[PDB]
Design a protein around this ligand. Structure first.
Ligand SMILES: NC(=O)CCCC(N)=O
Ligand SMILES: NC(=O)CCCC(N)=O
Lengths: 263, 269
């Protein structure tokens, strides 16, 4: 029930997919050498984020799972024998999704499409349409949400109610709030959260770094720098997320009272 | 001579140390501090959870024999007289006697009298020994200048509590509390942020029959700003002037309205 997990905090170079593959591969191998069995890459790690036109991301975005971002992550996951959640610009026909792929030592596992688009993402991407999915990676159930999804408590809650024990959270954070909020997201759902942020400035847009892993007890287990590329790997106890007990008289999920919510 | 604009109101928490089972002494303390808040211009004040009875009961008979009915009982009427006298609105936690049942409740009173009540939906720990789980739902009360939602202590742990209040139009969430865990001061700015509302957590202080409350009453803005936070141990008030337009405007930026951006068809399914 003890597993080592980690984020990959990296600086995507916008439109330079290959360079971004090489950087992700370098850091994931570092995380692998620290024993990470699950690693999370930031939102849109392959394409970067601050596009000027839909055309410039459309011209580089890859298809899932045939495209080269997914196939690259598949080869790396098979080579290292770990699981990867990574944000990627999804090409699907004539459309773009702000997505995340999940891959493991045996290949593609599935994808999530960002349900809550943030700001100018609505210019480029279609709203996610696959719902909030939880993926079985053998030793854990991992839910996936992307960046702004954190702002809506319903995102983490839906994943957690579907059995997610870890929420993998690729992010390109620009607002200051998520590092303060994610321990609450972890605590209120009694899950672990892995927020893999990017760093850097991109056409004048500053990302905040501060990738962090939070425990079901709102403990910040690891937090990254504001500006530097780095990994963070920690050993987590999945029993602490499977057991929703707060004390001998409160089980968080058994204590929910759906009849009084949203009505 | 110039306008200031905005829809301003001064709101406040009352951080006090209830004496368990000593209801009249607790009324006097509440009056003293609420008068201080009123002299600072507060128009809405929040008292802690179970401000009249205290919290850490040894038995249900202990609290049942002093608990007051709502709104006929002594706590509501005391708060009613006080709100009329000072011309303000009070939200206050109180043990509610209802037939042979006990509820962990909050009353809302204004200058014109009793407004309504809320019954704590999520009971915490030993409260399940003494209180019935609340059954009225999460309610929003119109106090003229603002719509106020009410939730009590451990309700904060469940994001659905504040979310339900805000989706029902709450611009302020009044939050009587007797906090024992360390988390609420860190979480309440997130509750305020994610719903774009003001939150007023009115915590008690003190050690009560071994159980230590954490104080740290706090008012948080729709931008997760801690506008006022209290000490761990002392009795005190905190009054701040808030712009209700900031709660009414759900636009985080010019392409993101928090409520219009919700996509319920993907939630809880
Ligand atoms: N990539 C994004 O969704 C940015 C908004 C989220 C944030 N906390 O800045
Ligand atoms: N009075 C209570 O509900 C205590 C549990 C909530 C807390 N944060 O301590």
């Amino acid at each position: 029930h003890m597993v080592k997990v980690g984020y990959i905090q990296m600086e995507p170079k916008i439109l330079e997919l290959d360079k971004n593959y090489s950087k992700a591969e370098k850091l994931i191998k570092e995380a692998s050498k620290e024993g990470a069995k699950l690693v999370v890459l930031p939102e849109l790690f392959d394409t970067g984020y601050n596009f000027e036109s839909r055309e410039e991301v459309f011209d580089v975005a890859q298809q899932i799972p045939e495209g080269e971002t997914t196939t690259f992550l598949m080869e790396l996951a098979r080579e290292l024998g770990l699981y990867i959640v990574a944000g990627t610009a999804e090409k699907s026909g004539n459309y773009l999704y702000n997505s995340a792929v999940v891959v493991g030592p045996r290949g593609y596992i599935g994808k999530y499409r960002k349900i809550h688009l943030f700001y100018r993402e609505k210019v480029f991407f279609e709203p996610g349409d696959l719902g909030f999915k939880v993926f079985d990676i053998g030793f854990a159930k991992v839910g996936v949400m992307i960046a702004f999804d954190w702002f809506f408590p319903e995102s983490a809650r839906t994943l957690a109610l579907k059995g997610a024990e870890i929420i993998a959270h690729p992010a390109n954070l620009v607002m200051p709030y998520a590092p303060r909020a994610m321990p609450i997201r972890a605590l209120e759902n009694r899950v672990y959260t892995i927020t893999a942020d990017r760093v850097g400035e991109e056409r004048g847009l500053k990302f905040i770094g501060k990738s962090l892993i939070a425990s079901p007890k709102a403990e910040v287990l690891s937090i990254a720098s504001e500006t530097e590329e780095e990994i963070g790997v920690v050993e987590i106890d999945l029993n602490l997320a499977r057991n929703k007990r707060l004390n001998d008289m409160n089980d968080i999920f058994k204590d929910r009272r759906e009849e009084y919510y949203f009505r």
